[PDB]
């Protein structure tokens, strides 16, 4: 959006249809970097100690939340005129940073709030239900105030409480039940993020290199629900609720233009 670098589609990995009907579910990642990068002299510039904020949601233009939660979805995988269907357990977002020049990925590390004691931690894959991306100033409020997204005014904006949904209207095969927890986020929020240079390399490292932030929308599928372990599509491992090996299969991916980290040495 106006704020932060723009995002472009990298690739759509595979269709996702509603199970009962076979109809295509429209998917669109809605990302925005609300702090950390701005343009100066034709360049998107960030700085070492100015940790950035990246947020994202995803939307289903052709399906409301209610319906979305009551339906079932499969990934359409095709290999040699042979189409298979993998059942979706839930949807989630993952972020990654890359060396825009040589595909090599660079680590992303988050820092806990200033007043909040706590060591740095790795960004998480975030289970999400369809939602519009709140505007910059709302995201800002969230980032600067503890538990504000949990107040009555913002709760419905940032969460879907499964334990508050009227079950009886849902089928036993509804997507809502296959999600990891009752508290499901509507917005994937990664605040106070920094690019972490490899510990194998010395300083400086980020200087003069172009980086790119990637936002990945995926569907976690259970290898036990199909024959074999190969979905036939790019994916990352992700333990399921019962610690069973699950599979974050890629659906859509987006990235920012080249990003530069500036400072002094």
Experimental method: X-ray
**3-state SS string over 67-103?**
HHHHCCEEEEEECCCCEEEEECCEEEEEEEEEECCCC
Rounded distance, CA 218 to CA 203, Å?
35
Rounded distance, CA 188 to CA 182, Å?
16
Tokens 């979305």 found at: 68
Q: Residue 159: beta bridge partners?
A: 185
The encoded tokens of residue 182 equal: 């009752």
Complete domains list, the chain, with CATH? 1-265 (2.60.40.1390)
Cβ atoms 235, 12 nearer than 8 A: no
> Which residues have CB under 8 Å from 106's CB, separation 6+?
97, 98, 99, 195, 196, 197, 198, 211
Rounded distance, CA 193 to CA 49, Å?
10
DSSP assigned state of 180: S
> What resolution in angstroms, rounded to 1 decimal?
2.3
Rounded distance, CA 182 to CA 185, Å?
10
Q: Pick from 234, 254, 238: which is nearest to 246 by CA?
A: 238
């Amino acid at each position: 959006f106006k704020v932060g670098p723009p995002f472009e589609l990298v690739r759509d990995y595979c269709p996702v249809v509603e199970s009962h009907t076979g109809r295509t579910l429209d998917l669109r990642i809605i990302p925005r970097i609300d702090r950390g990068f701005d343009h100066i002299d034709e360049e998107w510039v960030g700085y070492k100690r100015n940790y950035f904020t990246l947020v994202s949601t995803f939307e289903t233009a052709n399906c409301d939340l209610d319906t979305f939660l009551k339906s079932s979805f499969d990934l359409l995988v095709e290999d040699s005129s042979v189409e298979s269907r993998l059942r979706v357990q839930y949807f989630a977002i993952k972020i990654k940073a890359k060396n825009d020049d040589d595909d090599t990925e660079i680590n992303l590390v988050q820092h806990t709030a200033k007043r909040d004691k706590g060591p740095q931690f790795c960004p998480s894959v975030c289970p999400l239900v369809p939602s519009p991306l709140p505007k910059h100033q709302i995201i800002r409020e969230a980032s600067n105030v503890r538990n504000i997204t949990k107040t009555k005014k913002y709760d419905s904006t940032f969460y879907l409480h499964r334990n508050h949904v009227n079950y009886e209207e849902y089928g036993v095969d509804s997507l809502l039940f296959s999600y990891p927890e009752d508290s499901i986020q509507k917005v994937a929020r990664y605040e106070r993020v920094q690019f972490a240079s490899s510990i194998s390399v010395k300083k400086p490292f980020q200087q003069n290199k172009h980086f790119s932030l990637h936002v990945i929308l995926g569907a976690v599928v259970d290898p036990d629900t199909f024959h074999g372990e190969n979905p036939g599509i790019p994916y990352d491992e992700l333990a399921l609720k019962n610690g069973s090996k699950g599979m974050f299969v890629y659906l859509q991916e987006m990235k920012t233009p080249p990003l530069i980290i500036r400072g002094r040495s």
